[PDB]
Amino acid sequence: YQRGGWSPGSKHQKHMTLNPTLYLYRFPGPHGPGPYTMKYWWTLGCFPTGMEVPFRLHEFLSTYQQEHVPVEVEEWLRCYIKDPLSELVNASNDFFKAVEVYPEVESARGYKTLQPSIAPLLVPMKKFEEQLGVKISPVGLRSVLSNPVLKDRFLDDLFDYKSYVEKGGSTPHRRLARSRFEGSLPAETTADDERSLILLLTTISEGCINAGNYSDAASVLADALMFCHDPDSQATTHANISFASLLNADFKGAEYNGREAALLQPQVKPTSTACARGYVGWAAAAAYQDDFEKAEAIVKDGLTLYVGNEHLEKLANKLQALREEQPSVYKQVPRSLRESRSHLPSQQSRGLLSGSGKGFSNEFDWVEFKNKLYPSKMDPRNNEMGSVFRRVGDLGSFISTSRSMER
């Protein structure tokens, strides 16, 4: 009897005749409310014993009092937003200064030197992104800053964009305002500021590819595509997006952007090779999807259009090297086996990050059903043995199955 403390929070044996306590299922310990009780605090609304008074004054203060604004004040709040042009100018100036003051990395002999972290650059680039509607990858920015030639390209393009915006204004803002006014009541060519912007975004994407973040490279190219209204710039951006999607194993988007760059051929300047690169990307996406005859047809059409550009020739030689062996093994690639084998390390990393593991993140731990997690039993897409749906019965309506022993 009573081989420990007397409080209910103690850890030893007690007895009712000497230390009678009321039924306390689960309550927080001596240090703090654990997660096992915060679960009840968030689901049931109070701790599972009912003896604790719910005191949520702090979260009330944090949410409701803060988000409360009188209507008479919110009517005028929107009338004092900062000027977008001045905000863009200030953000561009600050970002340019922060990029220019970035130190040059010293090249050591015998080992790779650690690049200086972009500590004072995440906030200016954040303001730049939130003012221009385009997100920049920090890994790509770090790689561009590490690369000496890419850093010079980025600095020159950012300076040109600054000067153009400060001397003429923001052409994307003008376009959006004119479109909104026309909707309330055509399309000009790509301006100099838009050209500088898409150029610096292409530099950022090239640095991001040199780093090895193909998803972020493709995202930067995608949000840069929204600023080009010229056929040459659009074809170049489509070829770049096709290459980035090929690297990121986005075969569908790669093929789409490649055929878009190919379709932009008649209205492009003859010197540009963006259409050839688009044909290359299209054929490469086909070959990755294992459509070898389709890739051969695409590369043949590309060669006939451009008589033998080096990229098209190398891709055709690779396709011919694959064709000199595919009939020697299987005469073709089976239909039920296409786009089944992994070829790139990007999808390997993606599978490592978001695959099904032994025990968790599989179809036996928890299932998702309309943004809600369910146990393995309550799986509406499966009626395997062990599911609750095998115990429904006839529901007193009609004999649905001819089964005699169960259901």
Partner 1 sequence: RGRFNMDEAAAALQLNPAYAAALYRPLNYTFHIRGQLYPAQKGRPSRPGSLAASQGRMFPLYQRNDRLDKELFRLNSRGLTTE
Partner 2 sequence: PKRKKNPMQLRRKVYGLHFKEKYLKMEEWYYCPLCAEPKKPGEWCRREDCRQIKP
Partner 3 sequence: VDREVLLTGKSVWECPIHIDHTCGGSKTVPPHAKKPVRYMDAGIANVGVTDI
Q: Which residues bind partner 2 (CB under 8 A)?
A: 336-337, 340-342, 347-348, 350-352, 355-356, 363
Q: Which one of 15-23, 196-204, 252-260, 394-402 is the stretch in contact with partner 1 (CB under 8 A)?
A: 394-402
Binding partner of residue 45 among partner 3, partner 1, partner 2, none, CB under 5 to 8 Å per kind?
partner 1
Binding partner of residue 73 among partner 2, partner 1, partner 3, none, CB under 5 to 8 Å per kind?
partner 3
Closer CB to partner 3, residue 56 or residue 343?
Answer: 56
CA dihedral 23, 25, 28, 29 (to 10 degrees): 70
212 vs 235: CA distance, rounded Å: 24
Q: Does 64 bind partner 1 (CB under 8 A)?
A: yes
Q: Does 32 bind partner 1 (CB under 8 A)?
A: no
Q: How far is the CB of 346 from partner 2 (least distance, A)?
A: 9
Q: Does 68 bind partner 3 (CB under 8 A)?
A: yes
Options 35, 45, 103, 357; binder of partner 1; rule CB under 8 A: 45
The beta strand positions in 249-365, using DSSP E, are none
Binding partner of residue 398 among partner 3, partner 1, partner 2, none, CB under 5 to 8 Å per kind?
partner 1
CA 213 to chain centre: 11
Looking at residue 120, what DSSP letter applies? Answer: T
Q: Does 69 bind partner 3 (CB under 8 A)?
A: yes
Q: How far is the CB of 356 from partner 2 (least distance, A)?
A: 7
392 vs 360: CA distance, rounded Å: 28
Query: Are 302 and 283 contacting, i.e. CB atoms less than 8 angstroms apart?
Result: yes
Closer CB to partner 3, residue 65 or residue 117?
Answer: 65
Q: How far is the CB of 70 from partner 3 (least distance, A)?
A: 5
Closer CB to partner 2, residue 308 or residue 351?
Answer: 351
Q: How far is the CB of 64 from partner 1 (least distance, A)?
A: 7
Query: Are 234 and 253 contacting, i.e. CB atoms less than 8 angstroms apart?
Result: no
126 vs 356: CA distance, rounded Å: 35
Binding partner of residue 79 among partner 1, partner 2, partner 3, none, CB under 5 to 8 Å per kind?
none
196 vs 192: CA distance, rounded Å: 6
Q: Which one of 61-69, 93-101, 290-298, 317-325 is the stretch in contact with partner 3 (CB under 8 A)?
A: 61-69
Structure tokens at 334: 């089976």
346 vs 308: CA distance, rounded Å: 30
Closer CB to partner 2, residue 75 or residue 363?
Answer: 363
Give the amino acid at 279. Answer: Y
Name the 3-class secondary structure at 86.
Answer: helix
Q: Does 397 bind partner 1 (CB under 8 A)?
A: yes
Name the 3-class secondary structure at 22.
Answer: coil
- From 223, 195, 389, 353, select the one nearest 406 (Cα to Cα): 389
Query: What b-and-e string marks burial along 163-186, b requiring 16 or more CB atoms within 10 Å of the CB?
Result: ebbeeebbbbbebeeeeeeeeeee
Closer CB to partner 3, residue 20 or residue 70?
Answer: 70
Binding partner of residue 63 among partner 3, partner 1, partner 2, none, CB under 5 to 8 Å per kind?
partner 1
Structure tokens at 381: 């897409």
Name the 3-class secondary structure at 5.
Answer: coil
Q: How far is the CB of 110 from partner 2 (least distance, A)?
A: 31
Q: Which residues contribute to the site for partner 1 (CB under 8 A)?
A: 45, 63-64, 396-399
The contact set with partner 3 (CB under 8 A) reads 65-66, 68-70, 72-73
